[PDB]
């Protein structure tokens with residue numbers, strides 16, 4: 001027989017396919033699949049014996065389809081009355097997912113849907129602050145902090161080791177994490193160091209979890225590791241910037257720079273390409289700039305020079321900047 005559980009599994013299947021189509025740059029197909037997901041969800045609501053026993057996973061899939069309409073709204077709007085907006089689809093995604101909070105069942109997919117929608121809301125609110133006259137004199141942090149906080153509330157459980165891998169948690173589904181990282185960077189002035197340390201380890205744990213399975217294709221490990229490399233280097237800059245205004249700052253900045261080196265090495269092993277050596281060079285040059293010990297500084301500078309020389313010897317074009325660094329060395 002075909003159970004309610006099967007139905008929900010097929011619902012996820014439609015959504016998943018929409019994401020495969022998106023990845024192949026077939027946006028119109030993706031849009032068809034997303035709207036199809038929504039219709040099927042509606043059909044399930046019409047035919048179930050008790051809506052209150054639909055699992056969290058049902059509302060998670062439905063919320064995800066709604067969010068996807070917002071993501072692809074530029075094309076999707078063509079199939080809708082003009083009264084509709086991207087933002088209204090983000091709102092619906094949020095409300096649909098919140099309806100799931102009382103439903104029975106595993107909560108991982110719901111927590112992810114909630115976080116994704118709250119973060120997309122933050123992005124649109126930032127745009128509204130900059131473009132709508134009504135919101136001009138409301139401080140952005142006042143505007144978005146409640147959504148930021150709600151996002152973190154649902155991400156934190158997902159980032160725990162106790163939360164086992166689930167296949168809605170892909171590098172693509174974590175793209176809204178960029179919104180959070182950008183926010184903490186643009187407006188990190190208002191948060192304590194401990195807060196930043198906390199939220200950044202959540203973000204980082206999530207990217208890593210999305211590709212833990214060693215069988216994950218290199219292509220996906222790369223996207224995740226690139227996002228991790230970005231978070232490390234940004235934290236490093238957080239400290240280096242503070243320094244510009246202490247042994248502690250230097251020690252902390254150096255830990256993050258060295259974490260960046262470790263992660264760059266994972267990336268280089270995954271997609272070994274000569275132009276990547278310039279990224280290594282920049283990290284080493286940051287290390288050289290702040291290190292308090294000449295012996296170490298000497299080491300860093302040599303490593304940067306070798307990286308740059310090897311890049312150029314491998315056909316990579318050098319900017320005048322890199323060019324002069326190796327001359328001056």
Ligand SMILES: [Cl-]
Pocket residue numbers: 216217218219
């Ligand atoms: Cl592979």
